[PDB]
Amino acid sequence: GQVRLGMMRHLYVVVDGSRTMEDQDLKPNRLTCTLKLLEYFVEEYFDQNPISQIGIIVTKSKRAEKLTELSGNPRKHITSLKKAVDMTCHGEPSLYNSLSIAMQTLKHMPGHTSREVLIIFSSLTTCDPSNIYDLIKTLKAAKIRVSVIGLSAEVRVCTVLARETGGTYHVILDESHYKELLTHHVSPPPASSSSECSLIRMGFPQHTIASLSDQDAKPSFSMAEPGLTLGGYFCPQCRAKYCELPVECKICGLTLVSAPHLARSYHHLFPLDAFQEIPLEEYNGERFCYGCQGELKDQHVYVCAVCQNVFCVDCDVFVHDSLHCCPGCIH
Amino acid sequence: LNLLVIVVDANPIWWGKQALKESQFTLSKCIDAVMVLGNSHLFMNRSNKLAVIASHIQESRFLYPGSKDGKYELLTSANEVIVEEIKDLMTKSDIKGQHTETLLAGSLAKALCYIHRMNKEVKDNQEMKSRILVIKAAEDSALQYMNFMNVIFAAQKQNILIDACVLDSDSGLLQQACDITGGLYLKVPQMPSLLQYLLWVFLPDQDQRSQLILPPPVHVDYRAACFCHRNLIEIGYVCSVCLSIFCNFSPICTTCETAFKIS
Amino acid sequence: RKANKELEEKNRMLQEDPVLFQLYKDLVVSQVISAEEFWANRLNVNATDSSSTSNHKQDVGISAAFLADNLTSDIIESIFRTYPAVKMKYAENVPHNMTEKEFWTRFFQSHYFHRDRLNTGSKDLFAECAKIDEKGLKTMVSLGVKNPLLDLTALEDKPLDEGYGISSVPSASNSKSIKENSNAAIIKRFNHHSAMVLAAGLRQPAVKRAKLQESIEYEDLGKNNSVKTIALNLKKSDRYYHGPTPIQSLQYATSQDIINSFQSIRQEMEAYTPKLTQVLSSSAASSTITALSPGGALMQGGTQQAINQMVPNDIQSELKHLYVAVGELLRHFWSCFPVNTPFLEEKVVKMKSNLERFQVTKLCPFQEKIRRQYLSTNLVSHIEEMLQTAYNKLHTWQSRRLMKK
Amino acid sequence: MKLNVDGLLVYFPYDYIYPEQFSYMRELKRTLDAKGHGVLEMPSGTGKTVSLLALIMAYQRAYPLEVTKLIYCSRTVPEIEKVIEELRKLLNFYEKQEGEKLPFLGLAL
Amino acid sequence: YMESTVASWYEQGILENIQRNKLLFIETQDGAETSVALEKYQEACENGRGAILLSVARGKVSEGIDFVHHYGRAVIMFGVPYVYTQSRILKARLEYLRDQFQIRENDFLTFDAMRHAAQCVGRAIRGKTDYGLMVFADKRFARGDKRGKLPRWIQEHLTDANLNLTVDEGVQVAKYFLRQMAQPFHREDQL
Ligand SMILES: [Zn+2]
Ligand SMILES: [Zn+2]
Ligand SMILES: [Zn+2]
Ligand SMILES: [Zn+2]
């Protein structure tokens, strides 16, 4: 797509902790497989979108539990998921209070964040404290986007939830299909005609080591069991002390970003194109791969759009998944 | 099983100015230090693999992909084909004027997909730690920064380390790459001594970076400028449509012609 | 004494969170600000007990049925919502003439503990009251949503006619048994439990036709494939190509040098296959090694990191108290500070922030004097940098707003 | 989809059927070639009422010289209303294709 | 028989487990109580909580009703439409069909039972693009004459492996059915 995307993205993951998480349709029980692919999900999402954040709610025993708050580093989330392997999964799940707390925070937030909730939802019987239909009308009117990945069944309710919060509903066959769905929700989803297009004020703090062998330095502890920090990253708005640069300013409200962070997600904006895939021999006067200078010992030849060079299957998967650019069009 | 992928920045203009300088250190000792590093890497273990790429100004042609000398034949034949290939490459060449600064993004792209296919070649018993040495001697063009970051992030994902020996001038993008991927950066202070840095700071593999005490990491500058006046920024204005850095606040966003909503 | 309430609040806090109580003392008790301000602008708590309660899903009489073997559990709260007749009965019984001692003493009677006869355990009379609520909705009480939906004509079509019909035998005034009557009664109770559950969770041409309508609607073609896409066609992408790296000194000289260098390097690479260029290379090997070694070149006298670990632990506790306190101070300061918010209430809050700032600097100087005069080490001047930048933004805002007068 | 049902063009209402609809034509090809009652069995997949009306209108259009009035007979009152409104959809399709003059007194009772 | 079955699903400890999985709506022969049980059965599906309507294969519950795209996924035909209150109108119509028409006793009983059973289970594919489980629960539907009088568009999809399944084999066939038939079956798979 050549469309607007939601690139600052407070996503918020709601997992079941239902009775139906303990069912053994997957190769381990659904809790374990779901939690493993969420570990992979947090990894690839922080690997691809650096500005954004994640928060994890386990929904358990008709109540909702904010298990890990909305933050932007994978250590705390994956540590909490390694903890949450050990849980119990008892009682029916309430999708009311958790969506209420997520709405309550995601109603007054800066209008440019595409505020997104991902409900990995398994069971069928849901207890509703208010009216479910009025909750969807409210959540339709409340600026947020909710997408539900479903297990074992499809409720016209998850379809209404997905198409109204503006999300997408999906049901799971396999391990591989479920990986494809979470990979589909890694990428920044396109924006509606409703979300604010603001201009967030940003800060770009340089790294600062101990000035000149600590000749008149500023010895601090940290800012969020810490040692004595000699130098590091400042915050020019408030001039505080941060160890890791990609941290929302804890005492100002500025967002702090290093030079790579914006460049780590530039491929979404000038994206790739399609490779013309042709299996047969077909006029190939360029026998060797323009990717890595190797012969084409298979019947799959892939030719770009602009330069129209030659690529094999290995160069296809590598260019379209990782390098994100054609090597020909750079030249 | 390891895979060193040397990349030698064969700028014919730069080494031509180096050979008209009538110094001690010309391109012959550069490519010879490359081959002695390659034979040393194949020499350290039987299972090691080697691939040597030469970024020319307009092409990324690979160099690498009885015992009369007395060396192992699989080493004598490889050295003969690398020597004859650089002599066919650099001597009989072309001349163009619009594109005369060297490239490094394409050769790194070929190295990335080569390591991908050679990791598909690997069977289930063994595994392969891979890295890319970059021997840079020219000035990198700014014009391919959009491309260049991409290959770094590919080496971020594919877990390929990146190392760099720069010869004459410092290079911000390449020390940036060696900071991101976890590799190593080194600016040589005296050129005739280039061969064994490759032998003891860039020869040792991933399970010898942690054992050897090595020259310390230089602090990496995360300088950032606008697309407007190219000057250094500590607080900038970044659009959410174009995703571009502006220095001073402006009504109409130039990078994507955005009908900017004003509050 | 402050406020019968608040006095319990700020107190409850001071007591519990040991990292926050401390702070509360270090700020209020230290004579920097007043207790009311601190507890005032520190709103961070939950909405309700669970932002709502647990609605009566179903089997509110049969979740842990009749056995625990204005507050209560899930069953008592769901009955309090679901059957308001039981709510008014709880208003009558418990307020007048009996207590939970007498009421639960009259609860361990039969049908609930003696297992007499009531067709089920302790939710049986609750199911009978739900059946009476259904019969009140059908006989005494009426509905509400009955217009085109729940049409009267559809109801008229059912039930045939009062006079004798080909198959009149439908509802028989005779034939009332024991087990058959009990089974019919159970069905009515279950149907109304769902109806009461819908009433509790509220904080025919109707259904079939309305969902048939949901399946219709041409929403897909209603607007577009992806609403109103704002196609992002970037104007000046060259600003992306050479990014935020500053302009290096890049002055390649005149294109005569291009031709000269092409000539010299085409003549240079002409030579090949020496076999031996290692007379100079052995010189290089004796030379390359020196650079690798710490002695000589390539060593910066770096990775030293001379630290001051002399009195670790109690000074670390001091700095934990100090960074928590100054974090709260600068939290309030830079939270109200950023946008000027050009009115008189926010400027008055800024003046209170100025007073708290000056007394914070006094308390920080007092804490530095009481701490660092022990063994003469451990520069605390980072906290003084933070508070000096607060001081500086305050005076710079004052001069800026006086220029904006 | 513009069916030839051996005398007449038929505009399939919405434009979606399985290949069984082509088999469906053959089944009533026998039904109206000779007049004399006839029992059909289309399962519940195809437009029950929609299927029972497209081909009979195709025959009456191809050769409508021996048919005055259709008397549909469905039992339940919602079906009466449902079959009338599907007939009304088909006349609206029929008049979208043609023009405005589509004399047709449909009538429930 | 539904009276007696749902009676002995209570004294025997079964029906609370069926409650734990889905919400029952048992039938009665009131004209208004059936309509309320149907309305709550269709509201429960909209709530998303599992529902389950169990009725009699003779009455008005299955006459007017047409299978919903998502209102009935699994039509469970309990028993073979067999009665136990026949006076002599049945015996006399059967004596007539022996005598003056030529149709057997055991032929007409099987015909009548199968037209009622496949009537209450035969409107499932309201729209070609619908998935519908339709189980027959007793052994008599496998006995050749009774299976031979179901229509052709149901015998075509009645596999010999599916013939006389267990409960749990049928449950696993239902799971594999629903999983293979909940995927995107778009219009491009039909042209
Ligand atoms: Zn700040
Ligand atoms: Zn291309
Ligand atoms: Zn290739
Ligand atoms: Zn822009």
UniProtKB/Swiss-Prot annotation, chain A:
Q: Which residues form a coiled coil?
A: none
The Phosphotyrosine modification is found at Y45
Q: Please name the SUPFAM superfamilies in this protein's record.
A: Cysteine-rich domain, vWA-like
Q: Report, as the record phrases it, the tissue specificity of this protein.
A: Widely expressed, with higher expression in skeletal muscle.
In Gene Ontology terms, what is one molecular function of this protein?
RNA polymerase II general transcription initiation factor activity
Annotated phenotype, changing C307A: No effect on the transcriptional activity of the reconstituted TFIIH complex
Q: Where is the VWFA domain?
A: 10-186
Is Zinc-finger found in the keyword set? yes
- GO process terms (BP): G protein-coupled receptor internalization; nucleotide-excision repair; regulation of transcription by RNA polymerase II; response to UV; transcription by RNA polymerase II; transcription initiation at RNA polymerase II promoter
Effect caused by changing C304A? No effect on the transcriptional activity of the reconstituted TFIIH complex
Keywords annotated in UniProt: DNA damage, DNA repair, Host-virus interaction, Metal-binding, Nucleus, Phosphoprotein, Transcription, Transcription regulation, Zinc, Zinc-finger
What is an example of a Pfam family matching this protein?
Ssl1
Q: Matching InterPro entries, A to Z?
A: C1-like_sf, Ssl1-like, TFIIH_C1-like_dom, TFIIH_SSL1/p44, VWF_A, vWFA_dom_sf, Znf_C2H2_type, Znf_RING/FYVE/PHD
Write out the GO cellular component annotations. Answer: core TFIIH complex portion of holo TFIIH complex; nuclear speck; nucleoplasm; nucleus; transcription factor TFIID complex; transcription factor TFIIH core complex; transcription factor TFIIH holo complex
Chief subcellular location equals nucleus
Subcellular localization = Nucleus
Family statement drawn from the similarity comment of this UniProt entry: Belongs to the GTF2H2 family.
Q: What is this protein called?
A: General transcription factor IIH subunit 2
> Species lineage, top-down?
Eukaryota, Metazoa, Chordata, Craniata, Vertebrata
UniProtKB/Swiss-Prot annotation, chain C:
> What residues bear Phosphoserine in this entry?
S215
The record's subcellular locations are: Nucleus
Instruction: Tell me the ranges covered by the BSD domain, including all copies.
Output: 1-50, 70-115
Please provide, in alphabetical order, the Gene Ontology terms of the cellular component aspect for this entry.
nucleoplasm; transcription factor TFIIH core complex; transcription factor TFIIH holo complex
Q: In which domain of life is the source organism classified? A: Eukaryota
**BP term (GO), one:** transcription by RNA polymerase II
Q: Does the keyword Nucleus apply?
A: yes
Supply the alphabetized keyword list.
Acetylation, DNA damage, DNA repair, Host-virus interaction, Nucleus, Phosphoprotein, Repeat, Transcription, Transcription regulation, Ubl conjugation
GO molecular function terms listed in the Swiss-Prot or TrEMBL record: chromatin binding; nuclear thyroid hormone receptor binding
Membrane-spanning residues = none
Q: How is it modified after translation?
A: (Microbial infection) Upon Rift valley fever virus infection, interacts with NSs leading to ubiquitination by the NSs-FBXO3 E3 ligase and proteasome-dependent degradation.
Task: List modified residues, type N6-acetyllysine.
Answer: K123
Query: Key word DNA repair present in the record?
Result: yes
How this chain assembles, per its entry, is: Component of the 7-subunit TFIIH core complex composed of XPB/ERCC3, XPD/ERCC2, GTF2H1, GTF2H2, GTF2H3, GTF2H4 and GTF2H5, which is active in NER. The core complex associates with the 3-subunit CDK-activating kinase (CAK) module composed of CCNH/cyclin H, CDK7 and MNAT1 to form the 10-subunit holoenzyme (holo-TFIIH) active in transcription. Interacts with PUF60. (Microbial infection) Interacts with Rift valley fever virus NSs (via OmegaXaV motif); the interaction leads to TFIIH complex proteasomal degradation.
Q: Which family does it belong to?
A: Belongs to the TFB1 family.
Protein name as annotated: General transcription factor IIH subunit 1
Q: Which organism is it from?
A: Homo sapiens
Quote the range of the complete protein represented: 105 to 547 of 548
From Swiss-Prot, chain D:
PTM entry text: ISGylated.
The source's superkingdom equals Eukaryota
Sequence intervals crossing the membrane: none
The places in or outside the cell where this protein is found are: Nucleus; Cytoplasm, Cytoskeleton, Spindle
Tell me which residues bind ATP. Answer: M42, P43, S44, G45, T46, G47, K48, T49
Fill in the subunit field for this protein.
Answer: Component of the 7-subunit TFIIH core complex composed of XPB/ERCC3, XPD/ERCC2, GTF2H1, GTF2H2, GTF2H3, GTF2H4 and GTF2H5, which is active in NER. The core complex associates with the 3-subunit CDK-activating kinase (CAK) module composed of CCNH/cyclin H, CDK7 and MNAT1 to form the 10-subunit holoenzyme (holo-TFIIH) active in transcription. Interacts with GTF2H2 (p44) which stimulates the 5'-3' helicase activity of this subunit. Component of the MMXD complex, which includes CIAO1, ERCC2, CIAO2B, MMS19 and SLC25A5. Interacts with CIAO1 and CIAO2B; the interaction WITH CIAO2B is direct.
Illness association? Xeroderma pigmentosum complementation group D: An autosomal recessive pigmentary skin disorder characterized by solar hypersensitivity of the skin, high predisposition for developing cancers on areas exposed to sunlight and, in some cases, neurological abnormalities. The skin develops marked freckling and other pigmentation abnormalities. Some XP-D patients present features of Cockayne syndrome, including cachectic dwarfism, pigmentary retinopathy, ataxia, decreased nerve conduction velocities.
Question: What's this protein's family per the entry?
Answer: Belongs to the helicase family. RAD3/XPD subfamily.
Curated annotation (Swiss-Prot), chain E:
Q: Please outline how this chain is modified post-translation.
A: ISGylated.
The UniProt annotation puts motif Nuclear localization signal at: 139-152
Spell out the subcellular localization from the entry. Nucleus; Cytoplasm, Cytoskeleton, Spindle
Outcome recorded upon mutating G59D: In XP-D; combined with features of Cockayne syndrome
Q: What is the effect of changing D138N?
A: In XP-D and COFS2
Domain of life of the organism in this record? Eukaryota
Quaternary structure (record) = Component of the 7-subunit TFIIH core complex composed of XPB/ERCC3, XPD/ERCC2, GTF2H1, GTF2H2, GTF2H3, GTF2H4 and GTF2H5, which is active in NER. The core complex associates with the 3-subunit CDK-activating kinase (CAK) module composed of CCNH/cyclin H, CDK7 and MNAT1 to form the 10-subunit holoenzyme (holo-TFIIH) active in transcription. Interacts with GTF2H2 (p44) which stimulates the 5'-3' helicase activity of this subunit. Component of the MMXD complex, which includes CIAO1, ERCC2, CIAO2B, MMS19 and SLC25A5. Interacts with CIAO1 and CIAO2B; the interaction WITH CIAO2B is direct.
The name this protein carries in UniProt is General transcription and DNA repair factor IIH helicase subunit XPD
What organism is listed for this UniProt entry? Homo sapiens (Human)
Gene name on record?
A: ERCC2
Please tell me where this chain falls within the complete protein, as first and last residue plus total length: 544 to 734 of 760
